[model samples]
Target chain A: YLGKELQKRSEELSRGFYELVYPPVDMYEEGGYLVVVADLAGFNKEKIKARVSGQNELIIEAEREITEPGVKYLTQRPKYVRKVIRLPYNVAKDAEISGKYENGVLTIRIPIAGTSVFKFE
Target chain B: MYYLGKELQKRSEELSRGFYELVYPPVDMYEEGGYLVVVADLAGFNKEKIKARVSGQNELIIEAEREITEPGVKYLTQRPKYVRKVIRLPYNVAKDAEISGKYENGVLTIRIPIAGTSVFKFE
Candidate 1:
């Protein structure tokens, strides 16, 4: 079904994966904090960024560059992917997010305030 | 190596179909103190949903998640690994870096800077 280079475009895009395809993320509350854990591998520490986008929503964004550069002898198509997840519930505006890359996995922690019982019905 | 090798095989199978191969533009590498400037060509993607990171070495890492505006079908296969690419540097750099992203004409420019002097040598 590729009128163009779908695989090529796919490989190019998958170079640095966000939260879309790899490491599917889910949002939930833990002790009054909205925790979102995405499987982001091969990224660095300084690139993790988080900001408030709505009244109780935070927009977290990140990009991981492909550090391995060499001859493409037997290249396995590696492209980049980007993801933006909208929080399903209202959260504390005064929140905190921290990123860490360990064992080839990127994890983010979002600390929220106010009521811990967050449910949208 | 098994995982990597298997991934290569997958790519070969996908490329055999012959379609389009996406190539992101070169990365902008600028050196300032113990930091550096790196940029990626992200066409047809949203900069607001991008993410990036730096490894122990002078490696600039970037990642982002995009939503499909439209839908399509998938036949044939040169399944590229939409995962991550590790970029090496000329010298030893800092892990604490800053990235600035700008989207213009479907191109996303990310500016990354180094922290303080972590470790390096002079000739």
Candidate 2:
């Protein structure tokens, strides 16, 4: 586990925390399922990884070392940004993952693997 | 825990995140007749801002930088390392050789044309 790397953003920690805690949420249909997209840019893709739980859940974590000066600046600011998504239905264990970073936007596409959408049924 | 090589990245008003997250570990080298490939995980950098320099047949240098700003007052702080990668080849390459690069899946792939031959002698 990497230590936190934020010291300069201390003043706005609470405001940042609020923003992180309740990020934008939306739902849409993809093929036979719903695709949920999340934006994670601060941590490196090599450093940040994710895992899906047996209960149709997903967890993404970014463990960072405080080696950069920016980490010191992010201390006062919300340092730990955590998101827990309870997927609407089960997903294929071998689902395809495609991520791209352009103009500072990280987009990930996950294939839907359930029989039907709860809302639709 | 398990770094699946291509995890995830993010960006903010203060800093353009994942600009160099090493989506895939890079192996450094340069060589002639031996195809010199320089790859970097340049997440936030686009092809327009990237540059490469090949000197003679054994020396190669590359540098690139990207900056993203919010419309209003600039965030108090934002830092993304200006990328500078250099590779020295094991052999010489023709000056008019071909070179190419691409950015996808947060990975940068560079290709150089080279020629090599193997020899065998027995008595």
Candidate 3:
């Protein structure tokens, strides 16, 4: 738990310092599956890093080299990747979870474990 | 100079839906191997529809259009593709300059032969 918290904090700090922007993400339910869609153009599928932590937090990161010798940059923008999403409801992480990448968009399908109910009073 | 204003006005009018939202996409310009490279962010757009041309003296215009037609998907915020940007080059370009463009990973890379070099003069 400590390691996860530290990693989350480090990501936040780095995001702020680097002024990173989150790509477009869409989540919806269809046919008993919760689908998460994200646009990550310019990212190689083999190099993309993804992980699920703390039950529902989804972390996605993909990066590549962006510098060239003797190249001048008149304007600069943040990378089109990197995001941390908290799913809307509980999902079976161990279930038949699947993902696909197409035309720069990544789609992940999750099986809803059950209803989202807060037990803490 | 002459057609630049007209093209800009036409694009603005066509994209305006009751209100105008002017967006200037970020760009990077440099020179490499006697060619000037211009890279621009035009994400979520069809690569085939992007247009680039020289419309004025030392000015290059890059424009693209995007439309949202997917059903059951509501956007909390939307980006309109009125990518009408006019870039003024520091050096003159030849009348027969060769230009090419490539779209990859949502970035459009354009290469054009550099026709003239800028020289410093002492008065």
Scored by TM against the true chain B, the candidates give 0.50, 0.56, 0.68
Measured with DockQ on alpha carbons, how good is candidate 3? 0.20
Candidates' C-alpha lDDT: 0.46, 0.46, 0.61
Model 3 segments beyond 4 Å from truth?
A1-19, A75-81, A95-97, A114-121, B1-26, B41-44, B73-88, B94-97, B116-123
Q: Write model 3 residue lDDT over A1-121, tens digit each, in one string.
A: 8965764464445434222544555566666666776645555678777777766777778764454334453544334457787866667745556788764556777777762333356
Q: What's the distance in Å from true for residue B75, model 1?
A: 32
Which docking band does candidate 2 fall into? Answer: incorrect
Sorted by TM-score (best first), the order is 3, 2, 1
Provide backbone clash counts, one per model: 50, 27, 0
**lDDT score of residue B119 within candidate 1:** 40
Could you tell which candidate, 2 or 3, scores higher by lDDT?
3
| Alpha-carbon RMSD of each model | 16.4, 15.9, 12.7
**After best superposition, candidate 1 residue A59: deviation in angstroms?**
3.2
Candidate number achieving the greatest DockQ relative to the actual structure: 3
lDDT by residue for model 2 over A4-113, one digit each (tens)?
A: 32323343452354335422222344555444433332445576555668746666554433222221211211234455667666676666545543432354445567
Model 3 error, position A102 (Å): 3.5
Shift in Å, residue B8, candidate 3: 31
Q: Please rank every candidate by lDDT, starting with the best.
A: 3, 2, 1
